[PDB]
């Protein structure tokens, strides 16, 4: 399991639609996100806690399997153009980071060969906190 996802109403809806795409049929991360969104804690973009990793946030995180640190911006697949700076929410690490708070760690093992162990070190940029309610 993983900690409950904290997400704003708009991204929750967009991801719900995203997961419906047949391109993601049978994918472990898609199935996992569907289940997690059903029990996610949602709120308006203005009510979003300032330390939560949200879509389009830039986050510094550590891989708990090897100690490696990286900075990546979490984006929707349509916007993923550079793997050295961006991370798809549909990729295991992106899905694992989504909804976590700075300071949280996650040890998410899913059947089908997917497992992520990460720690959120810093939230360099969060759209909600910057007023970019994207509305
Ligand atoms: Cl997957």
Curated annotation (Swiss-Prot):
Protein name: Regulator of nucleoside diphosphate kinase
Knockout or disruption consequences: Mutant shows a significant reduction in the level of Ndk.
Family matches, as Pfam families: GreA_GreB, Rnk_N
InterPro entries: GreA/GreB_C_sf, Rnk, Rnk_N, Tscrpt_elong_fac_GreA/B_C, Tscrpt_elong_fac_GreA/B_fam
Chain's role: May act as an anti-Gre factor. Regulates the level of the nucleoside diphosphate kinase Ndk.
Domain notes: Contains a short N-terminal coiled-coil domain and a C-terminal globular domain.
Family that this chain belongs to: Belongs to the Rnk family.
Lineage: Bacteria, Pseudomonadati, Pseudomonadota, Gammaproteobacteria, Enterobacterales
């Amino acid at each position: 399991s993983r900690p409950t996802i904290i997400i704003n109403d708009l991204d929750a809806e967009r991801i719900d639609i995203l997961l419906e795409q047949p391109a993601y049929a049978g994918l472990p991360i898609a199935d996992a996100l569907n289940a997690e969104l059903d029990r996610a804690q949602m709120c308006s973009p203005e009510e979003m806690p300032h330390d939560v990793v949200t879509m389009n946030s830039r986050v510094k995180f550590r891989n708990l399997s090897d100690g490696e640190v990286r900075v990546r911006t979490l984006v929707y697949p349509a916007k993923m153009t550079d793997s050295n700076t961006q991370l798809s929410v549909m990729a295991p690490v992106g899905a694992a980071l989504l909804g976590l708070r700075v300071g949280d760690s996650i040890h998410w093992e899913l059947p089908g060969g997917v497992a992520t162990h990460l720690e959120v070190l810093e939230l360099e940029y969060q759209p909600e906190a910057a007023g970019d309610y994207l509305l």
